[PDB]
């Protein structure tokens, strides 16, 4: 009888979910120990426990065939069983899974251990990406110095790992096919539960792309005035080392030389943070305050007790790329961040605390539901708060921005600053997964892998390497997420939907009205808003219990991912920028790059 079996299945699921949570706790603890302290011993422990959990997952997936779950009445029960059938990498044979884990840790440890020699001191060779190299890329305006650090880092973080990356692609593909996906692309895309998801993103990207072109053109124009035409051409792709970021993913670090109105205020509170004696602890406490002010959950004692919020001062190797950790018990949540006292880092703190909040909000759910509605939702939470933190309105409240006059010109400066982070990022994010998808799908021959990467960066972002690269180089793994096997489409989704969340939260807070000149979207602060917090609670507490459109509906009554909100935010910038580019006869678009030899 199916009626009797469905009752037994419910009891089966409740026990199994609790078992999976407990087993994942053990794996997570070992993964935490390795990421905070990279050693051969900790790698071995992390990978051996993962192999053990994978073995158990195999048994679980096999056990689901004993239940007629597709025949059940409960949509909830069917959804849980469906989740249990999806093995991911755990579908691989024992030896293949062990090899993949060895390959993944080899790539992540390589990235984390990268050290370069000082440009001015060839005997000082202990400069790591975080913070040494990133500080130079963000602050130096010496184009040759920038080019040196670009080359040194990409050679060490990218090229050195080509063979491991090749084996990773092979095993990722094998795993996907064992789960009956065509490739790792489809495996990743399955997390969005929508068979038109790629086309939806193409459509949204196409709408925002013209604005990006205008920003690109104007920045290129302004860079030519700074560096001269020998360094930056009018018609070519922008040399990427000049954009204030190792991967040219976000350009806010060069705002001081590309700002629309240089005589008017440009928000950079890093100096005031230092002057007021800000610490990493204070920054996290302020983040905690923001969430609690919205009637959301305070950080538990375990967070403060166990988190790493500063780069360790011993000689040890660790992964410094910030991360949040759910240990699948009650209130055992942690962040690992190599925190610095800067404005950008203040946003990063809020980003990571967004993940933590999500963990706390759904910790009551069955294990399989203890994750985001889709990967983009998880990335978006903290960024919604960061948008309000970034406003002159909020920064004045916390005394970090002083003597600020919010006229038309200062507003354009602030909108442009935000766009250098939010619009510029969109083509970058798309290319990270367009690249990996093409490799996963077997669409690029191995002899063309490196120039396939730079071709996409050219086509979509209009940027290029500072020096000529070839198929002797392999540059993709120089980006953390590529070395660390972290899906990137989540960020494209996040940057779109975070404006849907922000707009709705702002309206709920009484902080945005499109017909009121005193309440513009770009100066909305949701701090202290219980109404905005209620929307977050309603959505986040769901976890992955329902398909993501239901989670969006719980927030604001909408069911569709839309670029309307992000375009609405930047509309006043679009009007000004289009006119400014025409006024200055600014060239738009770029010729095909010559910087990757086939
Ligand atoms: C990815 O896709 C794969 C297919 O491309 C898929 O692999 C298939 O999984 C099937 C299991 O669902 C499996 O089907 C079984 O086949 C057995 C014989 O297969 C042999 O010969 C094949 C060549 O003809 C070889 O290719 C194989 O290697 C094998 O050597 C059958 O003996 C078996 O049967 C039994 O089970 C059925 C199922 O019963 C179902 O459930 C209830 C049970 O209570 C039934 O009431 C209900 O009616 C329903 O049918 C019984 O009906 C039957 O009485 C037997 O007990 C079964 O059909 C198949 O072999 C396998 N490979 C191929 C090539 O087809 C993967 O599983 C997919 N992977 C994932 C992760 O989804
Ligand atoms: C700072 C720190 O915790 N370091 C630990 C060290 O104590 C231990 O000996 C090693 C074992 O691999 O792992 C790391
Ligand atoms: C002022 C306000 O809205 N406070 C809310 C309260 O109504 C709600 O019951 C609680 C549950 O999380 O969250 C908080
Ligand atoms: Zn994140």
Author numbering: 17 to 614
Manuscript excerpt for this entry:
Peptidyl dipeptidase A is a highly glycosylated ectoenzyme that cleaves dipeptides from the C-terminus of a broad range of oligopeptides. AnCE is a single-domain glycosylated protein that closely shares enzymatic properties with human ACE (in particular the C-domain of human somatic ACE) and is inhibited by classic inhibitors of the human enzymes 14–17. In this study, we elucidate how the natural peptides Ang II (the principal end-product of the renin-angiotensin–aldosterone system), Arg–Pro–Pro (the BK-derived peptide) and bradykinin-potentiating peptide-b (BPPb, a snake venom inhibitor) bind to the active site of AnCE, revealing novel interactions involving several enzyme subsites. Comparison of the four structures clearly shows a common mode of peptide binding to AnCE.
Therefore, it was not surprising that the structures of AnCE in complex with BK and Thr6–BK showed Arg–Pro–Pro bound in a similar fashion in the active site cleft. Strong hydrogen bond interactions with AnCE anchor the main chain of the N-terminal Arg (P1) at the S1 site (His367, His371 and Tyr507), which is also involved in coordination with the zinc ion. Furthermore, the side chain for this residue is stabilized through contact with Tyr496. Additionally, both structures bind a citrate ion (from the crystallization medium) at the same position, making contact with the N-terminus of the bound BK (1-3) peptide. The citrate ion also interacts directly with the AnCE main chain and the surrounding water molecules. The two Pro residues at positions P1′ and P2′ form a strong interaction with AnCE through hydrogen bonds with residues His497, His337 and Tyr504, Lys495 respectively. The general mode of binding for BK (1-3) appears similar to that of Ang II, particularly through the various hydrogen bonds with AnCE. Experimental evidence suggests a preferred affinity for Pro at the S2′ binding site and highlights the importance of the hydrophobic pocket (formed by residues Phe441, Phe511, Tyr504 and Tyr507) for peptide recognition, which allows the products of BK and Thr6–BK hydrolysis to shift position and ‘register’ in the active site subsites. In both cases, complete hydrolysis of the peptide to the end point resulted in clear visible electron density for the tripeptide (Arg–Pro–Pro) in their respective crystal structures.
